[PDB]
Every structure is written in C-alpha cells, then in structure tokens.
Amino acid sequence: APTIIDLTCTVATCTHSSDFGGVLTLTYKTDKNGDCSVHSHSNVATLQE
Amino acid sequence: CRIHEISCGAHSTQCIPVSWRCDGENDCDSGEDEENC
Amino acid sequence: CRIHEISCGAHSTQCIPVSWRCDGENDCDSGEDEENC
Amino acid sequence: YEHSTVMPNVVGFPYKAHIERPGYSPLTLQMQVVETSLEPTLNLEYITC
Ligand SMILES: [Ca+2]
Ligand SMILES: [Ca+2]
C-alpha cells in the first residue's frame, strides 16, 4: 500500500446546501503511485467518493 | 517495477498499477495507457 | 492534458486553452498555435 | 443570481462591474452608453405665421 506523510488540508469553497456544495484539496508526498481509501471521521460532513 | 505495475513506455521511468490502463483517464504522462485500446 | 487544452507540440509539456489559438498571440514557446492558421 | 449597481450617466465612459459569488470565479462586466435621449411630452396651444 502507498505511504502518505505530511498531509495538510484546506478548503477552496463551501456553501451548505442539499447538493454537494463544497470542495477541499489535500496536499501530500508519497513514494509510489497507487489507490487509497478516503473517509471522513465525523457526521457534520459527508464525502462523495 | 512491481509485477502488478506497468510503465508508460521505455522513454519514461514512471510505473503505474495495471488497473489504471484503459480506464478513461490519461493516467500516464501523455495518455500512453489509452493508446491502442 | 484536458480536452479544452491543446499541447504546444509533443516536445512541450505545457498545454494552453483552445481559445488561445489564432488570436494573434504567440502563447506557445515558438508560436506553434498560430502556424498554418 | 441577482445583482444591483449604479453607473454614471456619462457618454463614452467605460464602466466595469464585478460579480463575486461563492463556488464560482469572479466575473467582470463591461457596460457603456452610446447615446441618451430625453423627450418631454408636449401639448399644442397654437401656431403663428
Ligand atoms: Ca487509463
Ligand atoms: Ca495564440
């Protein structure tokens, strides 16, 4: 599995609506290309992918 | 690279998992995976 | 690159938007966009 | 989207309006006036010759 270190998060835009009204970007550095499983550990926000 | 990894041509040293070939996206440097599919 | 982006030739890794073609501006490194317009 | 602004009544003055909304890039509108006409309503009284 890939290795992720020094992961920082920021939000580009947000608008609380019924639709998926929000975009966030994650920056990181790895050692090889691959596929990861992403998740939100709370109930305030629900992801899409 | 790994057994489950294929390279984007001999001229490029990057290697990507085989599940990314012909996936509808240009995962390689210049869409080499989607070539001839 | 993206569908709306056209590369400045195979030797260049920079892609410019299609709206930048035939506009009288040499957006490419050697102005390949306006050649043979 | 609904927006409102004011623009000076000077012929040939280039007016630039800025539209900024969450979730979209800002837009710049250009508005100009080329000719203004002002016509009073008239009622005749008589003619002379
Ligand atoms: Ca692919
Ligand atoms: Ca051009």
Side-chain angles (χ1 to χ4, degrees):
Chain A
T3 305
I4 321 293
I5 49 192
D6 259 6
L7 176 89
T8 85
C9 164
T10 172
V11 156
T13 166
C14 176
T15 292
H16 60 92
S17 99
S18 301
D19 198 330
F20 281 79
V23 159
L24 64 102
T25 55
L26 300 157
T27 88
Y28 59 102
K29 74 182 41 163
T30 72
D31 72 16
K32 54 152 171 303
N33 314 314
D35 39 316
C36 273
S37 87
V38 79
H39 184 224
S40 164
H41 281 263
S42 155
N43 189 41
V44 188
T46 166
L47 283 198
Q48 164 142 327
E49 55 270 38
Chain B
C1 33
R2 206 63 141 142
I3 168 176
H4 284 111
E5 293 188 311
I6 49 162
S7 185
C8 303
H11 272 246
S12 181
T13 81
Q14 61 149 35
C15 202
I16 49 186
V18 311
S19 324
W20 286 7
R21 183 169 199 202
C22 301
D23 55 14
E25 270 302 271
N26 47 10
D27 316 83
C28 276
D29 56 76
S30 35
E32 280 63 44
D33 43 288
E34 311 285 326
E35 298 299 323
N36 231 312
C37 201
Chain C
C1 271
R2 206 74 153 159
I3 169 175
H4 303 104
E5 301 182 305
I6 44 148
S7 180
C8 279
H11 262 264
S12 176
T13 65
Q14 293 284 280
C15 51
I16 56 193
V18 300
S19 40
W20 278 11
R21 205 158 209 175
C22 295
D23 55 7
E25 275 298 276
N26 285 311
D27 311 86
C28 275
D29 56 80
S30 45
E32 303 108 33
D33 41 309
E34 319 276 307
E35 299 317 303
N36 206 260
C37 175
Chain D
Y1 206 91
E2 167 175 317
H3 196 261
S4 304
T5 170
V6 297
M7 80 194 253
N9 185 18
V10 177
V11 174
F13 182 59
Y15 187 94
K16 270 128 202 90
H18 208 188
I19 294 324
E20 173 171 39
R21 61 182 300 203
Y24 290 104
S25 192
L27 191 69
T28 297
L29 255 166
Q30 300 188 62
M31 276 169 308
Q32 202 165 331
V33 194
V34 285
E35 146 196 322
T36 84
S37 158
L38 175 59
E39 336 175 345
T41 175
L42 312 180
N43 63 5
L44 199 136
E45 276 280 5
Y46 49 58
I47 79 184
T48 324
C49 48

